Design an enzyme around this catalytic site. Sequence first.
Site, PDB file in Angstrom:
ATOM      1  N   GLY A  74       0.767  -1.243   0.000  1.00 61.83           N
ATOM      2  CA  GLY A  74       0.000   0.000   0.000  1.00 61.83           C
ATOM      3  C   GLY A  74       0.795   1.288   0.000  1.00 61.83           C
ATOM      4  O   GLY A  74       0.402   2.265  -0.648  1.00 61.83           O
ATOM      5  N   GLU A 115      -0.108  -1.084  -6.179  1.00 57.83           N
ATOM      6  CA  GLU A 115      -1.490  -0.666  -5.929  1.00 57.83           C
ATOM      7  C   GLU A 115      -1.719   0.832  -6.165  1.00 57.83           C
ATOM      8  O   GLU A 115      -1.654   1.626  -5.219  1.00 57.83           O
ATOM      9  CB  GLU A 115      -1.914  -1.055  -4.506  1.00 57.83           C
ATOM     10  CG  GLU A 115      -1.724  -2.542  -4.239  1.00 57.83           C
ATOM     11  CD  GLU A 115      -1.897  -2.939  -2.791  1.00 57.83           C
ATOM     12  OE1 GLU A 115      -2.294  -2.097  -1.955  1.00 57.83           O
ATOM     13  OE2 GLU A 115      -1.647  -4.126  -2.508  1.00 57.83           O
ATOM     14  N   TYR A 234     -10.443  -6.894   9.256  1.00 57.17           N
ATOM     15  CA  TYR A 234     -10.481  -5.602   9.919  1.00 57.17           C
ATOM     16  C   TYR A 234     -11.680  -4.825   9.399  1.00 57.17           C
ATOM     17  O   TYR A 234     -12.258  -5.168   8.357  1.00 57.17           O
ATOM     18  CB  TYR A 234      -9.181  -4.812   9.660  1.00 57.17           C
ATOM     19  CG  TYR A 234      -8.997  -4.349   8.231  1.00 57.17           C
ATOM     20  CD1 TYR A 234      -9.454  -3.093   7.811  1.00 57.17           C
ATOM     21  CD2 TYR A 234      -8.354  -5.163   7.298  1.00 57.17           C
ATOM     22  CE1 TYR A 234      -9.276  -2.669   6.494  1.00 57.17           C
ATOM     23  CE2 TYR A 234      -8.185  -4.757   5.992  1.00 57.17           C
ATOM     24  CZ  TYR A 234      -8.636  -3.514   5.593  1.00 57.17           C
ATOM     25  OH  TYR A 234      -8.460  -3.135   4.282  1.00 57.17           O
TER      26      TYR A 234
END
Length: 344
Positions: A74, A115, A234
């Site tokens: 990320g 990403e 999560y």
Amino acid sequence: TVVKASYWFPASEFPVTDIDSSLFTHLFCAFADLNSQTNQVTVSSANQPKFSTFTQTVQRRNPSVKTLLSIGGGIADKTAYASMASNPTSRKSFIDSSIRVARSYGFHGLDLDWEYPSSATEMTNFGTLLREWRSAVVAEASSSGKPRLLLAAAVFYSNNYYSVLYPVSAVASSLDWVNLMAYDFYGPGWSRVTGPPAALFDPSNAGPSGDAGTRSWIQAGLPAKKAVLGFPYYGYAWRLTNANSHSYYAPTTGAAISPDGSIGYGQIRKFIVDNGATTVYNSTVVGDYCYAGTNWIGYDDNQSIVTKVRYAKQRGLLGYFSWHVGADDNSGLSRAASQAWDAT
């Protein structure tokens, strides 16, 4: 045949020995880095000990489990990845080093987590990178006599990334599979209302869903047996504007619990017990949520996971993966996932 997978990362502080490897076929260790000056895949000196022992350690609880080393993630520098992929010589140093690293660290394969490529230029380069990568692992397996390294990539929940299209042909011919990131749909950082951050379905067709993305990938040519469906361990927490309005798409004043609202599944379960929270499994979207007072959390619990695993199996997908193994509550979701797969 089947991928039952999860990601592990060192900042989770979850001991590698605590991974119940008997519940998985493949484990991802994240993340190796791209050196922007050399264009090589490198493991940070901080990560070197745990990454290098990851495989033999997880194999203690399941000698058959396979591992992949994930690259990027990320917070990677996307301009570095784009520069690397743009040129045959920089692609070669990336490819060759990635293969040396995997072999030396004892991984069974490699997973690229860019990403995301965000233009047709980057997508073209991305596709070329994968083709050369596949030829290279094929070449190294014939040259070393060892089983071929696996190749995978974490990808957008859809093949259509805000009008930029993945090179599906290159993906399908080059990779063993793609990890579909069917989550982070809603969060208080970008949504002023509550919502199902990983919804399998959206009847109103107003937002993203794992089913819509997956179908879009398959329509564009991805074989179903090259798709692994992801779900989050999560959720996101919002602060409700009004306690009496607590469904999906309810008004909020911003994030609760943390800065971007994110909270691991283990901590959600604790929130529920500690607060005696209201709990909802919404079957229309396939998403769980809970609330107490003005705290509202959308996430995946048992029923969301089981439904998604069954969807994956019944629609001919290769399997499933979770982000991330260190946020589960005593392997409860992963155990449910495996059993749900095996029974279907």
